[PDB]
Amino acid sequence: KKISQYACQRRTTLNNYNQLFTDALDILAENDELRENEGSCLAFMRASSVLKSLPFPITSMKDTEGIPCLGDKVKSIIEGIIEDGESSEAKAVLNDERYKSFKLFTSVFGVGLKTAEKWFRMGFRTLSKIQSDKSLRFTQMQKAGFLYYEDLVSCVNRPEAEAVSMLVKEAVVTFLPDALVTMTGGFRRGKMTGHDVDFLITSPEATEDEEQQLLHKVTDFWKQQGLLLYCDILESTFEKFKQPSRKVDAADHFQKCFLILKLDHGRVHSEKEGKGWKAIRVDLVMCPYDRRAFALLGWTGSRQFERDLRRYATHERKMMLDNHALYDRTKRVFLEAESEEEIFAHLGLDYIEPWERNA
Ligand SMILES: O=C(/C=C/c1cc(C(=O)c2cccc(F)c2)c[nH]1)/C=C(/O)C(=O)O
Ligand code: NA
């Protein structure tokens, strides 16, 4: 059969046989994001995504025949890597002063594209020179980002993610004992590591007020217990009867919080001390019970899988999909789902397992 142009019609597992090509294409896509070239960024992301789905490594240009999303620019990059095992294009990006600075500065929690650009234009090149500067003013997010930098830059492993899951579940059930807590993001897709641990929380019997107060109760409990190192709660802007997003990259309107938690080493059951704890980035999302499948699907990712799911729904099925709902423009009805499988069925897609969504 023919490989689909949509990530939602491909099985993308963590055994990537084309890391030589995709690491180069991911660097080129990231540079186009920095250079504000959204179009070229998207073309490299789609090419990298399709190669990640292959069950074999590309070893000749003939191997690329019949593969979609491989334009002439991309094929030149693949050709170059086949030639000497390296990408001269990606090598130039890795040695570029702006690219190096952007990667380094945005590696700090609280620093995005605008602050990284600002510091570069000010002549900063190292985090040591930024942190020690007496004229710079930092946001509370950046202060936390610098204070817990070494812990946050070290990858969160599965024993740590599970230790955090235990803490989240223990805190949540204290206030809502019927609540369902699910680990989402990369770890749900089978990843060994991640930069953070994400969770979806839902309750079948909670009221609108109970739903709203849970993240405040849980974070106050952790603040009392001296485990809350950073906390930012974004209130819900969810609209029960609004049509799903038409945007390329849909925004999530559910109540959520961006945290840094103190994880004591005694809570981690691993193969393996220092201060005896590690700072961990944790995100919590609270959603209404009836929207739990849409939120789970959205938060499981990957970002490319989500983009293609929504693009397929729009272009192929005249349906509108987002983290909150699924709307059928032809039948003029919202479609209900109690599981991810039901969402895939509504869209006419064969079910793709979470570990097959690493697009
Ligand atoms: O990999 C991509 C990100 C989506 C995504 C969401 C997350 C987390 O936030 C996350 C991380 C670790 C643990 C955890 F529980 C949650 C992980 N995957 C996107 C590509 O497709 C690309 O950029 O090419
Ligand atoms: Na950052």
For the chain, the three-class secondary structure string (H helix, E strand, C coil) is CCCCCCHHHCCECCCCCCHHHHHHHHHHHHHHHHCCCHHHHHHHHHHHHHHHCCCCCCCCHHHHCCCCCCCHHHHHHHHHHHHHCCCHHHHHHHCCHHHHHHHHHHCCCCCCHHHHHHHHHCCCCCHHHHHCCCCCCCCHHHHHHHHCHHHHHCCEEHHHHHHHHHHHHHHHHHHCCCCEEEECHHHHCCCCEECCEEEEEECCCCCHHHHHHHHHHHHHHHHHCCCEEEEEEECCCCCCCCCCCCCCCCCCCCEEEEEEEEEEHHHCCCCCCCCCEEEEEEEEEECCHHHHHHHHHHHHCCHHHHHHHHHHHHHHHCEEECCCCEEECCCCEECCCCCHHHHHHHCCCCCCCHHHECC
Question: Does 50 contact ligand 1 (Cβ within 6 A)?
Answer: no
The CB-side HSE value for 265 (13 A sphere, CA atoms) comes to 8
Show which residues are catalytic: 196, 198, 283
- Judge contact between 298 and 290, C-beta under 8 A: no
Nearest CA to ligand 1 atom 7: 185
Which residues contribute to the annotated binding site? 186-191, 195-198, 283, 298-299
Q: Which amino acid is at 100?
A: K
CA–centroid distance, 95 to ligand 2, in Å, is 20
C-beta 298 within 6 A of ligand 1:
no
As a whole number of angstroms, the distance between CA 172 and CA 170 comes to 6
Q: Report CA(188)–ligand 1 centroid distance (Å).
A: 10
Give residue 111 CA to ligand 2 midpoint distance, Å: 4
Residue 285 tokens read as 């999302």
- Extract the annotated binding site for a 2'-deoxyribonucleoside 5'-triphosphate: 186-191, 195-198, 298-299
Tokens 């080129």 locate to 28
Domains of the chain by start residue, with CATH = 1-95 (1.10.150.110), 96-154 (1.10.150.20), 155-289 (3.30.460.10), 290-358 (3.30.210.10)
Q: Decide: 162 and 156 in contact? Cβ < 8 Å.
A: no
- For 352, phi then psi, to 5°, come to -105, 115
Among the listed residues 121, 127, 123, 137, the one whose alpha carbon sits nearest the alpha carbon of residue 104:
127
141 Cβ contact partners less than 8 Å away, ≥ 6 residues apart: 109, 110, 230, 232
Q: Which of 32, 300, 304, 308 to mutate to test the pocket of ligand 1 (most atoms within 8 A of CB)?
A: 304
Calpha distance 163→159 (Å, rounded): 6
Establish whether residue 45 lines the binding site of ligand 1, counting it when its CB lies within 6 angstroms of any ligand atom.
Answer: yes
| Angle made by CA atoms 281, 179, 354, in degrees to the nearest 5 | 60
Q: How far apart are CA 307 and CA 319, in angstroms?
A: 14
Cβ(280) – ligand 1 distance below 6 Å: no
Cβ 246 under 6 angstroms from ligand 1: no
Q: Which residue owns the Cα nearest ligand 1 atom 8?
A: 185
Pairing status of strand 277-286 against strand 197-202: parallel
For residue 103, which amino acid is it? K
> Does residue 8 have its Cβ closer than 6 Å to ligand 1?
no
Strand partners, 228: 261
Whether residue 30 has its Cβ less than 6 Å from ligand 1: no
Cα 186 to averaged position of ligand 1 atoms, centre (Å): 5
Residues 6+ apart with CB under 8 A from 341: 351
Determined by: X-ray
Residue set of the binding site for Mg(2+): 196, 198, 283
**Cα atoms in the Cβ-side hemisphere of radius 13 Å centred on 344:** 15
Q: Which ligand is nearest to the CA of 303?
A: 1
CA of 261 to the centre of ligand 1 (A): 19
The Cα–Cα gap between 357 and 359 comes to 6
41 within ligand 1 shell (Cβ under 6 A): no
Ligand 1: centre distance to CA 97 (Å): 26
Please report where in the chains the tokens 């650009």 appear, as a residue: 117
